[PDB]
Design an enzyme around this catalytic site. Structure first.
Site, PDB file in Angstrom:
ATOM      1  N   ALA A  31      38.708  38.157  43.389  1.00 14.75           N
ATOM      2  CA  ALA A  31      38.740  39.414  42.653  1.00 14.75           C
ATOM      3  C   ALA A  31      37.399  40.152  42.681  1.00 14.75           C
ATOM      4  O   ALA A  31      37.405  41.368  42.866  1.00 14.75           O
ATOM      5  CB  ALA A  31      39.108  39.104  41.204  1.00 14.75           C
ATOM      6  N   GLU A  32      36.241  39.463  42.541  1.00 12.77           N
ATOM      7  CA  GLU A  32      35.006  40.263  42.471  1.00 12.77           C
ATOM      8  C   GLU A  32      34.655  40.810  43.847  1.00 12.77           C
ATOM      9  O   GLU A  32      34.086  41.917  43.930  1.00 12.77           O
ATOM     10  CB  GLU A  32      33.835  39.438  41.896  1.00 12.77           C
ATOM     11  CG  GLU A  32      34.168  38.849  40.522  1.00 12.77           C
ATOM     12  CD  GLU A  32      34.191  39.854  39.389  1.00 12.77           C
ATOM     13  OE1 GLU A  32      34.277  41.088  39.571  1.00 12.77           O
ATOM     14  OE2 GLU A  32      34.079  39.438  38.218  1.00 12.77           O
ATOM     15  N   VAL A  33      34.933  40.052  44.905  1.00 13.11           N
ATOM     16  CA  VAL A  33      34.606  40.534  46.253  1.00 13.11           C
ATOM     17  C   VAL A  33      35.547  41.689  46.600  1.00 13.11           C
ATOM     18  O   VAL A  33      35.138  42.657  47.246  1.00 13.11           O
ATOM     19  CB  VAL A  33      34.643  39.496  47.387  1.00 13.11           C
ATOM     20  CG1 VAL A  33      33.459  38.510  47.279  1.00 13.11           C
ATOM     21  CG2 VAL A  33      35.965  38.761  47.424  1.00 13.11           C
ATOM     22  N   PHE A  71      33.893  44.642  44.742  1.00 11.48           N
ATOM     23  CA  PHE A  71      32.516  45.011  45.074  1.00 11.48           C
ATOM     24  C   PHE A  71      32.149  44.611  46.493  1.00 11.48           C
ATOM     25  O   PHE A  71      32.004  43.416  46.758  1.00 11.48           O
ATOM     26  CB  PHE A  71      31.539  44.308  44.100  1.00 11.48           C
ATOM     27  CG  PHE A  71      31.801  44.622  42.638  1.00 11.48           C
ATOM     28  CD1 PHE A  71      31.484  45.887  42.139  1.00 11.48           C
ATOM     29  CD2 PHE A  71      32.364  43.677  41.794  1.00 11.48           C
ATOM     30  CE1 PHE A  71      31.756  46.209  40.824  1.00 11.48           C
ATOM     31  CE2 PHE A  71      32.625  43.997  40.459  1.00 11.48           C
ATOM     32  CZ  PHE A  71      32.328  45.258  39.987  1.00 11.48           C
ATOM     33  N   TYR A 126      33.937  35.094  31.353  1.00 13.72           N
ATOM     34  CA  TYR A 126      32.982  34.256  32.048  1.00 13.72           C
ATOM     35  C   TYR A 126      32.193  33.371  31.088  1.00 13.72           C
ATOM     36  O   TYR A 126      32.037  32.189  31.382  1.00 13.72           O
ATOM     37  CB  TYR A 126      31.970  35.127  32.838  1.00 13.72           C
ATOM     38  CG  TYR A 126      32.528  35.590  34.171  1.00 13.72           C
ATOM     39  CD1 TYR A 126      32.588  36.949  34.468  1.00 13.72           C
ATOM     40  CD2 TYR A 126      32.950  34.689  35.126  1.00 13.72           C
ATOM     41  CE1 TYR A 126      33.055  37.381  35.702  1.00 13.72           C
ATOM     42  CE2 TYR A 126      33.441  35.094  36.368  1.00 13.72           C
ATOM     43  CZ  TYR A 126      33.474  36.458  36.630  1.00 13.72           C
ATOM     44  OH  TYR A 126      33.945  36.897  37.853  1.00 13.72           O
TER      45      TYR A 126
END
EC number: 3.2.2.22
Length: 253
Positions: A175-177, A180, A120
């Site tokens: 990917a992050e959703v 998480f 990031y």
């Protein structure tokens, strides 16, 4: 390669949640469970290395590649302003050879190795964010924001700032959703609007690995042997983390 399409022409919250579940359902091994919880766990590496995500608008499609063993981003495919399909990739995640199987539409000379790395920090430097902390947090999240950033790369000349901004949003919204549920629920509660991100989003994102290894090795029946803190308060119950997918760490205990 398996591909999963998100239709962004007047989407519903139920369609976005089903899309997230298809990602989770493609990479998980239903036989694994860690720490006595029922959270889905990514399966071991295999020869089907990549997953293709298509974002469809009424103007065209932009595609994103993710690794199936860890959900890291690998490349993206978009047509430029002369309608030529171009694939852009991170060399540490995929080779030019494997990229022709992931995006068959782009020929070898139409592939470009990105000049920055996939962490990031490095994408954020290339996104040129001048407000607040200068991180992705200042761009917000949301379906409408994914659509606007997607459209800035779809059939347009490549512009590093637009590309990097697109990547930051597209990775978080896939990917992050998937990892998480806190982040998924934020998108859903504010559907389809753009909304502010917060430190809790950022804290989950940098702690995937510490969370996964703590559940695997320091949790019994869903409760941690001691307090953990990922920056949003002390936690003892694994269910306060609202996890959607854990990293693969091998066979349980």
């Amino acid at each position: 390669v398996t591909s999963i399409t998100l239709d962004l022409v007047n989407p519903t919250a139920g369609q976005y949640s089903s899309f997230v579940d298809k990602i989770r359902n493609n990479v998980k091994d239903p036989n694994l469970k860690y720490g006595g919880t029922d959270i889905a766990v990514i399966g071991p590496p295999s020869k089907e290395k990549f997953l293709r995500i298509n974002f469809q608008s009424s103007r065209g499609t932009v595609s994103l590649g993710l690794k199936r063993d860890n959900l890291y981003v690998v490349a993206y495919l978009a047509m430029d302003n002369t309608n030529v399909n171009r694939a852009y990739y991170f060399k540490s995640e995929i080779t030019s050879a494997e990229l022709t199987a992931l995006f068959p539409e782009a020929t070898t000379a139409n592939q470009k190795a990105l000049e920055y790395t996939e962490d990031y920090q490095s994408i954020e430097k290339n996104a040129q964010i001048t407000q607040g902390d200068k991180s992705r947090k200042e761009l917000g999240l949301g379906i409408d924001l994914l659509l606007t950033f997607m459209e800035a790369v779809n059939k347009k000349a490549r512009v590093v700032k637009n590309e990097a901004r697109f990547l930051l949003i597209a990775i978080q919204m896939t990917a992050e959703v998937a990892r998480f549920r806190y982040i998924q629920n934020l998108v859903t509660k504010n559907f389809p609007n753009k909304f502010d991100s917060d430190n809790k989003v950022i804290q989950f994102e940098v702690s995937w690995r510490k969370i996964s290894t703590a559940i695997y090795g320091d949790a019994k029946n869903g409760v941690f042997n001691k307090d953990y803190d990922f920056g949003f308060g002390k936690v003892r119950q694994v269910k306060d983390l609202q996890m959607g997918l854990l990293m693969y760490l091998g066979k349980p205990k």
